[PDB]
């Protein structure tokens, strides 16, 4: 594993964060590749991409994703002003992150319909400190672990629905886990 933090590896920005509980390892590989292995973890997020992201990036990803429990695979990032955490969820484990959330529409992109949702985090950690902020979700109906994400289709659909993004901060393909187990090997471009 590598040390939790952010940086660059083989031309790609990476972010790896965990809650210190244990049970997760993250490694950076050649090019845009990263691997995650976890067993009875806490909460963590790790992956590779760009800092800053853009609003018209076509993100390609390929590999394997084998969660056993609560985990997501998504295009993941933030905006500032307004502060927003966003997820284009391509696959997940035992928990659909939109469970109980308000549905804000649908968008068809890259071979599937996605359902759009908005949620709110209240006094939670963020890229600017503790804050209350919205989260935007596109949840893919047809789960997969390779493909291409035309981010503009999502960001445009969100904007149409009144879900405004500010200036982009980082933008990665991320494996997120919450007290679960699994393995993943993903290459980004």
From Swiss-Prot:
Residues that carry a glycan: 37, 60
Subcellular location: Secreted
GO molecular function terms noted in the UniProt entry: endo-1,4-beta-xylanase activity
Induction behaviour: Induced by D-xylose, dependent on the cellulase and xylanase regulator xyr1. Repressed by glucose through negative regulation by the crabon catabolite repressor cre1.
Pathways involved: Glycan degradation; xylan degradation
Main location, first listed in the record: secreted
Chain ranges of the GH11 domain: 1-188
Catalyzed reaction equations: Endohydrolysis of (1->4)-beta-D-xylosidic linkages in xylans
Task performed by this protein: Glycoside hydrolase involved in the hydrolysis of xylan, a major plant cell wall hemicellulose made up of 1,4-beta-linked D-xylopyranose residues. Catalyzes the endohydrolysis of the main-chain 1,4-beta-glycosidic bonds connecting the xylose subunits yielding various xylooligosaccharides and xylose. The catalysis proceeds by a double-displacement reaction mechanism with a putative covalent glycosyl-enzyme intermediate, with retention of the anomeric configuration. Produces xylobiose and xylose as the main degradation products.
UniProt name for this protein: Endo-1,4-beta-xylanase 2
Gene designation: xyn2
Section covered of the full-length record: 35 to 223 of 223
């Amino acid at each position: 594993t590598i040390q939790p933090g952010t940086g660059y590896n083989n031309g790609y920005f990476y972010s790896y964060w965990n809650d210190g509980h244990g049970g997760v390892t993250y490694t950076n590989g050649p090019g845009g590749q990263f691997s995650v292995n976890w067993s009875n973890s806490g909460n963590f997020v790790g992956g590779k991409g760009w800092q800053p992201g853009t609003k018209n990036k076509v993100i390609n990803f390929s590999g394997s994703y084998n969660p056993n429990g609560n985990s997501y695979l998504s295009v993941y990032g933030w905006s500032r002003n307004p502060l927003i955490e966003y997820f284009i969820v391509e696959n997940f484990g035992t928990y659909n992150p939109s469970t109980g959330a308000t549905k804000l529409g649908e968008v068809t992109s890259d071979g599937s319909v996605y359902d759009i949702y908005r949620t709110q985090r209240v006094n939670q950690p963020s890229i600017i400190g503790t804050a209350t902020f919205y989260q935007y979700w596109s949840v893919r109906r047809n789960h997969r672990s390779s493909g291409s994400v035309n981010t503009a289709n999502h960001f445009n659909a969100w904007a149409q629905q009144g879900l405004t993004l500010g200036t982009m901060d980082y933008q990665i393909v991320a494996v997120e886990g919450y007290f679960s187990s699994g393995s993943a090997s993903i290459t980004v471009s």
